[PDB]
Design a protein around this ligand. Structure first.
Ligand SMILES: CCCCCCCCCCCCO[C@@H]1O[C@H](CO)[C@@H](O[C@H]2O[C@H](CO)[C@@H](O)[C@H](O)[C@H]2O)[C@H](O)[C@H]1O
Ligand SMILES: CCCCCCCCCCCC
Ligand SMILES: CCCCCCCCCC
Ligand SMILES: CCCCCCCCCC
Lengths: 49, 48, 48, 48
């Protein structure tokens, strides 16, 4: 594979640009937070007498 | 035919830009929609 | 309607770029891909 | 690793400057020369 892309430098650059393009687009559609949802979920039963 | 087309060359690049301008014209003029209203052999009438 | 709208130009821009890049890899040339990409208008003129 | 098997080799075989046999940057003018000498001297210490 290395010898393949030494003769084909444009092919090598093409794979790199497509990976970067996909990444650049992903940055725009990606959510932003401090943490993920890692805390355990809880369910409360509220009643009144 | 192509043999002689490859001799002229510059004539068809002027012909090409006319096709792009012609395409560009038609694209703008042609109205845009999403999905056409299909006849489904049924419809309704409101009475208010 | 207030939610998004007109996201076609943005996606057909990268569609063009990615098609050019894939062609450049096929021919191992930054220039030859253009000779293939310039037939796009020939099919659009017929449709319009 | 994929970058180091695809892109990195392609760049090393295109956009790298030819180095003459024996040249270890010990003749480089200024700070880089001192650092190159310090490392070459320190590599000898380390191996010993
Ligand atoms: C129809 C809408 C418009 C789109 C047209 C695009 C498709 C072209 C259709 C085929 C036309 C082929 O027409 C072809 O033209 C070339 C170039 O002028 C001619 O070539 C002629 O002129 C050239 C120079 O101008 C001479 O060097 C050559 O010896 C002579 O034969 C061919 O004799 C002819 O067969
Ligand atoms: C023949 C190889 C040409 C080298 C130049 C390629 C540079 C591409 C950079 C693109 C970054 C988005
Ligand atoms: C989309 C950004 C990359 C465009 C290709 C540039 C190629 C330069 C060849 C000299
Ligand atoms: C990174 C260079 C380290 C070389 C150490 C040599 C030790 C010498 C004997 C005390």
């Amino acid at each position: 594979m290395p010898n393949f892309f030494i003769d084909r430098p444009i092919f090598a650059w093409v794979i790199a640009i497509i990976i970067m393009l996909a990444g650049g687009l992903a940055i725009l559609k990606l959510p932003v937070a401090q943490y993920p949802t890692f805390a355990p979920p809880a369910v409360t039963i509220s009643a009144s007498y | 035919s192509v043999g002689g087309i490859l001799r002229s060359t510059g004539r068809y690049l002027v012909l090409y830009l006319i096709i792009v301008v012609g395409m560009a014209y038609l694209f703008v003029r042609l109205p845009s929609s999403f999905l056409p209203d299909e006849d489904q052999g049924v419809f309704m009438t409101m009475v208010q | 309607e207030r939610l998004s709208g007109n996201q076609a130009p943005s996606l057909y821009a990268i569609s063009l770029i990615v098609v050019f890049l894939c062609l450049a890899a096929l021919y191992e040339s930054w220039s030859i891909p253009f000779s293939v990409m310039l037939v796009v208008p020939l099919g659009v003129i017929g449709a319009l | 690793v994929l970058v180091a098997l695809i892109l990195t080799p392609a760049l090393c075989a295109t956009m790298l400057k030819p180095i003459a046999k024996g040249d270890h940057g010990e003749g480089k003018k200024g700070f880089f020369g001192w650092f190159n000498r310090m490392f070459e001297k320190s590599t000898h210490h380390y191996t010993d």
